[model samples]
Target: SMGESRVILAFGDSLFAGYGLDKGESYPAKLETALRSHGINARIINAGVSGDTTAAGLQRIKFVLDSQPDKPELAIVELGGNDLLRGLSPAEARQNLSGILEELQRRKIPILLMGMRAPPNLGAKYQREFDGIYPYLAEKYDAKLVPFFLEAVADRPDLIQKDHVHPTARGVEELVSATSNAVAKALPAK
Candidate 1:
């Protein structure tokens, strides 16, 4: 039987913002199509903002959630990339993400964290510290996670955009392919 529509908030940076893609090509937009194809009633909000760091997301989440047309059943927190780009403190990023998580939890929304990774050239220690953030936080909060969220597209030049950071539209599809199952599972049974 088809279930009622489940709204998922896709809160993230440019990766989810459809940085260079056409309208309706963002990850959330493509994901809704993917989920429906699988017979799930998924309604995802594209709450992504270009160039947003975890701090920005933390600052804006209250209003975003406040403004949602419907209470969200799940929130896909995809952040920390801009933090990596700007060479921000992992501790601060971690804290900001925690703040976001706390707010979402307070609202009783289930979370599916989209975790990121730091390239090795960034420094082994920094890489380790940044790499540790996601798993540690996911385990700490007991939230579902997509560790190294860009795994399917990150290393592929063909899939990445000229900026050498954002992925192309095909890349988004690859991401949706790799991630949709987890997202489908994360939704609460209605």
Candidate 2:
């Protein structure tokens, strides 16, 4: 296990971008620490850009993929929050995410598709439509769906930032802790 190593691409928007938090507090950075502490040698590429929609991500994904000197062993696709905030069509969001997933599939890379939920104010129909995207695509691409990226910390306002959306530094730690199980599973067995 001394020389075993893996690269992971953390691809998405502000949630992964660590919006209001310091760079080191971002989920990717924290995740790297968590993984290494667990004895898995990993390099997490933070490919998150604030306010990026699924469509924008699809267009520029190849750049991140090609630019990585080491081909990523896994990709964590966390997107769609902006699309929901803008009230964009759920179908369009789904299609853009599908495109991103398709490209990763073509590369024969494993994926951890992080899901996002729409605000309840968007109405039941919109919520259902948006919520359905992750599961559908995960099944189609055979990727592991984390269910919801904000899982444990979402319901706790203290963990969330002033925006009431993104997480604070401690929240990021909780995120890393909660999601690390799935992440560890994605890696090759040590």
Candidate 3:
């Protein structure tokens, strides 16, 4: 191969997994394409699971990392929303995310934390506690971040399906554009 791929392990939930979307339509797939257009040589391995909470996600990190042929160049961690939906404790979610970060750190893989927020009407206090999980861990682990990747499409509530369970194709595009730059920036310089 003239150029090696930048192996990125995208670890998250339904949003990352493509959910109702078809092959090549997943966020990671489009991001791979976007990274190519940006000249990043990115190969994003999608490890998204519907209903994947942070605690559940944490259980798979080590196994998934070991399963990789090589240590990933970077990882994009997205979770917490599912946890919030479960009304799980912010402390537990924070700890779960920390565990994920610690595992990545131990592998010496750089990380890009994709922050998610609690739904509005959760009250300002709980919202802040839940929302702050991302930045707090990003700082603690010296990781990069995309503050609320969904912020790009929040206005277009219609971008999501009527089911309110998943985003539509147009929504995926918004997500890719909003965060691909951050991912490109996080790639280790060759």
Q: In model 1, what lDDT does residue 139 have?
A: 84
Summarize candidate 1's per-residue lDDT along 1-190 as a digit string, tens digits: 5667989999998989999999998899999999977878888989999999999999999999999989999999999999998888999999999999999999999999998999765788898899899998898887999987999997697987775656667989999999999999999989
Candidate 3 residue lDDT tens string, 1-190: 3688989999999999988888899899999989867769888889988889999999999999989996789999998889888878899999999999999998899999998988765678889899988889999999999998899888897777566545567889989999999999999979
What is the lDDT, from 0 to 100, of the residue 138 in candidate 1? 91
Candidate 2 structure lDDT? 0.92
**Candidate number with the higher TM-score (1 or 2):** 2
- Stretches > 4 Å off in candidate 3: 164-190
Q: Name the Cα RMSD for model 2.
A: 16.4
Model 1 off-target regions past 4 Å?
Answer: 1-4, 164-190
TM-score of the candidate numbered 1? 0.83
Against the hidden reference, what TM-scores do the models get?
Answer: 0.83, 0.83, 0.83
Show model 2 residue runs off by greater than 4 Å.
Answer: 164-190
Positional deviation of residue 65's Cα in model 3 after best superposition, in angstroms: 0.3
- Please give the lDDT score at residue 115 for candidate 2: 87
